[PDB]
Structure 1
């Protein structure tokens, strides 16, 4: 029997210290978990809030402590996804219980993102009704607004027909409702070279002044809603309006990092999806300095990666027009490519490495292989360094030794198994090898080494015998291997042309 005062005292005694909740997990006093998980519909709202608060406090554990505890933590998380039925009664509960429930769901999805969530549709329906009835009619309290923000955060974490249309309509309504208050701060004084009209705005490199959203909840709601709208709206307007385009262009210079990042994601989406959009190079020249500045911010969101977007733009222009790349020419004149190559040479020379340094080096190798995919200038400039090919051979040799060591111990191990930790590293190195091998002078002078060819053949044979023998490791262990086979065969089919020496 646990009352409100007992749960309040337990909650007060567990703040800060992480050893006491580990003790609560380990001890046979864990019967409270049953009381923590039997959320009856007849229970009091204060009791429900105390139970949800204690559930949130107990699961807020450091990774070392959750490694000490073990499988019981994940058992509690899975039972939270399976036992409590607050999602079915989303419209029936009050706003505080809903807010604490979505906060607990956010924590559970953050700690255990593998197991399935079987009640997303009820949450989507509750979100649609909540924004259609209360928020859009200016009849919302504080807790409902924070619940909408938490639901937007939870919906952004989903990996992934009528409900999609309803969600798109609701998000467009949220964007139009919020952005219409700050739409009067757009001001640009320009010159057309041939007065209150808006003809010829897309002929200058200037963008309107900085637009600042003073309200913090409005800025958070606008950012999250516009990101989900970017996820949704092509399946089902706002992109083609000139006023909204100027509004986002003015939002590019804001103070909030999330606003700048979501503006960069909004403006650069039609280049990859729309047809004949890549001819608009003036918008690209207007956008690119702010992406370069977005490389330089210390707190960055998890949904924004400047390396991926720059690489995607360069690969797009390499695939469409191989002879002319606007991004490379506008980055070479403004001293950015030399900085990128210098940072790559600095990352390859760090005395101490971890997983983060490997990921940074992998992104640098990918962008450097994207530089030299269709230009001989950057190919020869990269091959001017005499220590790059040594590191390429070192990476290939490391992967071969790792694969051979895993093959040699297949009987002892024998089912989900994690992949080999440097599959992306080797894939990026093979991308550089292919881009270097795409030129005849390098095939006849610089890539003359037999070690590269024998390493490629060894990688192919070892990966094929992995797929033949150790198939019990699962698909997550084998998909990077088959990708490596494809890239190695591409490099090989480049080296086997008749007028190459190998």
Structure 2
């Protein structure tokens, strides 16, 4: 508990002795921690090093010994985070003191990652100054080199709390929020990392060698569509390898946020350097090369149509599955699944990754591994996670290919496991709701709103994604997925998750986010069974899906236009952070599908249960998906009905002004906003096709005709707004056709359409590039010519 010599004696005694280490955590010997945790200036370099060494040795326990020790271990860890001040004097400490301190910090961050660490900025400034003064100028020591390596590891461990935008693409890489006071230091950090990378990697560039043939010498670098990558580049220096790997990973984190030209990622020699690094002997180097080469596909535009680079990188990504010690920051499952989803969602009907994997026998191996994982006799957490990953990747296979849908459904034992998973989750939820009061009473005193999530959530989410992928085909919906058990399980999951949200909000936000996500996915999978020409629509309607949708849509949690009661302030505070937009979008999706190609009897039943004000509560929702689904639901509702059109007119008349403002302000380059625009135009069609009164009312408005003219004047060269879109052109032509079709006011309307200048546009569209627009325009012109006599 004193006496540097005695400190070293205790260290020598303790090295490797878990029993003795545990013995120093009990009543009489705890006094040593009051001396270890108090390191102040002017103690002495040797004494500080001895204290840090002894403290690191003492804290180096296994989990089955931390269980014996208890919460005193974590009190000591928190004391190290809080009541120590070696980070404030990082620039004045000694090198060995800094190294030992950072090593202890890595141990603490590994054993207790939730405790808040308050001195990250001091460490970042120390790293920046150390790199800028010592490392780059070559006047550095072994202690400083190992210190900067440990600092790079510590910086890589940070969770980093990136931003959340609900309107961004769901399959691109998420980036981190940045302010100005942090922006200056971020720029400095990125500059330091880039300088380290350049300095270390500029010693091996002369090792790049490639011989190739161009079909129509050196010092030209003409064309690189070869599929052959340069010879291997090997870094013999181990410290250089560690620095290059860690610095390049952190630079990946930092480099798309720094403005500039002639970036390192867009270089011509560095890309070949990394391609050669793909063949290295060091697994860290290989994985970092994979990350660096695959990032642009998710963080860049138009990069996805560069399939030659993918075709030359894929063999090594497939090889990376087989190496035993993999780093913690590399998951080949996630990388492969991300690529497959990228191509599934940008260009369907053509998946380069799937064709490359299918021609070279890899998909069959993956499916064999999936079956073997499902068939194991004993499972644990590792096997459950591996099975979850396999289910996700198989869902990504089957998402957009009937070939793989039928191939996976030819197993006859897969739906059994799907139903087993759903049943197990339902059982867990029922038990939790039954024990709610006792669980609250027991865990309310310290675990107020911090409770772990149910362990089965990832498994059941993967099963629900797979089902959502299967249910996308009519052959499956009518032959093999025609089981009432699946519909029962989906409805039960919806009901149970909503009840859990209503009653068990005391469990916090970690417990409830997976339940909200499961609710979203199960709605997304129900909205396929609900569509017409599917045998389970009657089952879903008999078993009350509209009632569940109504409960979910009148809730103040999902519907912001509703006010919280006075008993629900606790719920308001507890659940305020969770984002719920997928749930709303999919609820409106289901309603839209229920209203497809139905009669006014069904329409009036749904409007009796869910009124029209409730549907209009979402018309101005900040999320684009909710707006799009509301507009498409309005289209399906107004389709072939005069009563509902009158109701919608009564709810507003400035309806045409509202639609004109929406049409002018929406951005046609967004998929959801373009869907909303199509919905608006076809609402106009369905409104015009009702009566002579409605035809007159639509022709009176001038903004509508201005928008129609602006859409119809677009051509191949003039494509600034609306993108010269055949769907919008056909919608406008349909509006005009309904205005002219069905006999005195019709001729006046024709004359008005001629004077406004739409006759010229219809005659101009006869020479279009799309046959549908050409034929519709010529028929409309013929009818106008007939009525113009």
What TM-score do the two structures reach when normalised by structure 1? 0.99
Residue 408 (structure 1) shift? 1.0
- Cα deviation code 1:298-352 (max 9, x no counterpart): 0000000000000000000000001100000000000000000000000000000
Q: Does the residue aligned with 1:196 lie in a helix, a strand or coil?
A: coil
What is aligned with 2:13? 13
Shift of 1:31: 1.0
Q: Distance in 2 between matches of 1:283 and 1:200?
A: 16
C-alpha distance in 1 between matches for 2:225 and 2:197: 27
Instruction: Report the 3-state secondary structure (helix = DSSP H, G, I; strand = E; otherwise coil) of the residue aligned with 2:130.
Output: helix
After superposing the two structures, state which structure 1 stretch, 481-490 or 1-10, moved more: 1-10
Secondary structure class of the residue paired with 1:269: helix
CA–CA separation in structure 1 for the residues paired with 2:380 and 2:524: 30
In 1, Cα distance between the equivalents of 2:222 and 2:391? 40
Shift of the alpha carbon at 1:200? Answer: 3.7
Structure 1 CA distance for aligned equivalents of residues 439 and 304 of structure 2: 51
Q: 1:344 to 1:298 in 2, by over 3 A?
A: same
Residue deviations 1:426-476, cap 9 Å, x none?
000000000000111100000000000000000010000000001111100
Any idea what the Cα deviations from partners look like across 1:381-436, whole Å, max 9, x if unmatched? Answer: 00000000000000000000111111111111113111111100000000000000
Aligned to 1:184: 206
Counterparts of 2:125 and 2:145, CA distance in 1: 16
- Say whether residues 1:165 and 2:187 are aligned partners: yes
Q: CA deviation at 1:10?
A: 0.6
Instruction: Kindly state the Cα deviation for residue 42 of structure 1 after the two structures are TM-superposed.
Output: 1.2
Alpha-carbon distance, 1:187 to partner:
0.2
Q: Quote the Cα distance in structure 1 between the aligned partners of 2:225 and 2:340.
A: 23
3-state SS of the aligned residue for 1:203? Answer: coil
Q: Structure 1 residue 418 and structure 2 residue 452: aligned?
A: yes
**Which range moved further: 12-21 or 377-386?**
12-21
Query: Hey, what's the Cα distance between the residues in 1 that align with 2:134 and 2:373?
Result: 52
Residue 482 of structure 1 and its aligned partner are, at CA, apart by 0.2
In terms of mean alpha carbon deviation, does 27-36 or 370-379 score higher? 27-36
Alpha-carbon offset, residue 16 of structure 1: 1.0
Tell whether the 8 Å contact from 1:190 to 1:201 is kept in structure 2 after alignment. no
Aligned CA distance change for structure 1 residues 200 and 324 (closer, same or farther; 3 Å): farther
**Range with bigger deviation, 434-443 or 193-202:** 193-202
1:296 pairs, out of 311, 319, 322, with 322
2:339 is paired with a residue whose SS is: helix
Residue 46 of structure 1: CA displacement? 0.5
List alignment gaps of at least 5 residues for structure 2.
Answer: 161-182, 441-448, 536-789
1:198 Cα offset (Å): 3.8
TM-fit CA distance, 1:199: 3.5
Aligned-partner SS, 2:511: helix
Q: Out of 105-114 and 197-206, give the one that drifted further.
A: 197-206
**Displacement after TM superposition at 1:201 (Å):** 3.6
Q: Helix, strand or coil for the counterpart of 1:25?
A: coil
How far apart, in 2, do the equivalents of 1:140 and 1:201 lie?
Answer: 42
Moved more, 66-75 or 118-127: 66-75
Q: Answer yes or no: is the 8 Å Cα contact 1:227–1:262 preserved in 2.
A: yes
Q: Report how far residue 288 of structure 1 moved.
A: 0.2
* Contact 1:463–1:481, Cα closer than 8 Å, also in 2: yes
> Segments of 4+ in structure 1 off by > 3 A?
197-201
The alignment's TM-score, normalised by the length of structure 2, stands at: 0.63
The one of 292, 303, 306 aligned to 2:332? 306
Greater mean deviation of Cα atoms: 489-498 or 198-207: 198-207
Aligned counterparts of 2:151 and 2:395: Cα–Cα separation in 1:
39
CA contact (8 A) 1:202 1:282 kept: no
Work out the CA distance in 2 between the residues paired with 1:347 and 1:433: 19
108-117 or 20-29, which deviates more: 20-29
Does the C-alpha gap of structure 1 residues 451 and 168 become closer, same or farther in structure 2, counting only changes over 3 Å? same
How many residues are aligned here? 501
Whose relative contact order is higher, 1 or 2, with alpha carbons under 8 Å and at least 6 apart? 1
Counterparts of 1:110-125 in structure 2 under 5 Å? 110-125=110-125
Q: Is the 8 A contact 1:362 1:428 kept in 2?
A: yes
Give secondary structure in 2 for the equivalent of 1:497. coil
CA distance in 1, matches of 2:198, 2:114: 35
Residue 246 (1) aligns with residue 246 (2): no
Q: CA deviation at 1:196?
A: 1.1
Given that 1:307 and 1:367 are in contact with CA atoms closer than 8 Å, whether structure 2 keeps it comes out as yes
Aligned partner of residue 60 in structure 2, secondary structure: coil
Q: Residue deviations 1:129-173, cap 9 Å, x none?
A: 000000000000000000000000000000011010000000000
CA distance in 1, matches of 2:384, 2:26: 36
The CA distance in 1 between the partners of 2:427 and 2:206, in whole Å, is: 63
Per the alignment, residue 147 of structure 2 pairs with: 147
Deviation at 1:202, TM superposition (A): 2.1
What's the CA shift for 1:68? 1.0
Output one character per residue of 1:70-102: Cα deviation in whole Å (capped at 9) or x when no partner.
111110011111111000000000100000000
Mapped to 2, the partners of 1:361 and 1:198 lie a distance apart of 49
1:172 and 1:147 map into 2 onto residues whose CA distance is: 18
Task: Tell me the alpha carbon deviations over residues 12-44 of structure 1, each in whole angstroms, 9 at most, x when there is no partner.
Answer: 111111111111112332111010011010101
Secondary structure of the structure 2 residue equivalent to 1:28: helix
1:197 Cα deviation from its structure 2 partner: 3.2
Aligned-pair Cα RMSD in Å: 0.7
Q: Distance in 1 between matches of 2:499 and 2:220?
A: 64
State how far apart, in whole Å, the 1-side matches of 2:326 and 2:346 are.
31
Alpha-carbon shift at residue 3 of structure 1 (Å)? 0.5
1:172-223 C-alpha deviation (Å, 9 max, x unpaired): 0000000000110000000001101344442101000000000000000000
Q: 1:485 to 1:211 in 2, by over 3 A?
A: same
Distance in 1 between residues matched to 2:12 and 2:508, nearest whole Å: 45
Match of 2:396 in 1: 370
Larger Cα Rg: Structure 1 or Structure 2?
2
Q: Secondary structure at the match of 2:488?
A: helix
**1:6-405 mapped onto 2 (5 Å cutoff):** 6-160=6-160, 161-236=183-258, 237-405=263-431
